[PDB]
Amino acid sequence: VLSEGEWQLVLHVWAKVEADVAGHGQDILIRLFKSHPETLEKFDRFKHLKTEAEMKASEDLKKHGVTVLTALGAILKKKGHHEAELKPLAQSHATKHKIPIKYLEFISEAIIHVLHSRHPGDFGADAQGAMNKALELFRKDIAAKYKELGYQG
Numbered sequence: 001v002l003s004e005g006e007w008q009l010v011l012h013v014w015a016k017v018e019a020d021v022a023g024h025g026q027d028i029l030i031r032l033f034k035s036h037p038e039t040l041e042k043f044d045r046f047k048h049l050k051t052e053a054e055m056k057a058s059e060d061l062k063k064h065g066v067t068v069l070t071a072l073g074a075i076l077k078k079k080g081h082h083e084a085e086l087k088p089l090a091q092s093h094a095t096k097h098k099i100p101i102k103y104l105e106f107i108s109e110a111i112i113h114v115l116h117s118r119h120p121g122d123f124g125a126d127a128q129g130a131m132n133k134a135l136e137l138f139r140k141d142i143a144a145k146y147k148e149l150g151y152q153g
């Protein structure tokens, strides 16, 4: 779990993400993609830029990145109360997104990378540990939802 302090730190960092949700959103995906080709092959609309983003990966990347961060954002904002549901998103990433979490650990790395890159000095040990823990909770929540939905069970 995350303590009130850890949540406040997370929300503080996230206010910076949210302030430039689109930017973080794109950056995170671009980073994820360039780091792990397999994550890029997955999204048909991004996959077309086969060489992990032909230095474009925009407009649609923005739309998704925003959707994506807003969802994880809501989760984080709800400080443990698992997006009020999570289940529908667990279901998509379960059935369509190629079952196991895996890639969510890659986006966790991407998130940590963008955060550290854009917000050094303040995104220190405590902040990164807190964000990482929050991402781990998120991944763990999806893992539990995969059991509920009758996949991970």
Ligand code: HEM
Pocket (backbone or CB within 6 Å): 039, 040, 042, 043, 044, 045, 064, 067, 068, 069, 071, 072, 088, 089, 092, 093, 097, 103, 104, 106, 107
């Ligand atoms: C921060 C973690 C993530 C969150 C909060 C998230 C959120 C979302 C949301 C809200 C949607 C649209 C509705 C839905 O289908 O559920 C979506 C779709 C999708 N997600 Fe994720 N997602 C996450 C991570 C991932 C990762 C790491 C991958 C693959 C590397 C992935 C691949 C997809 C795909 C392929 C779609 C379908 C739409 C697309 O082609 O753009 N997701 N995601």
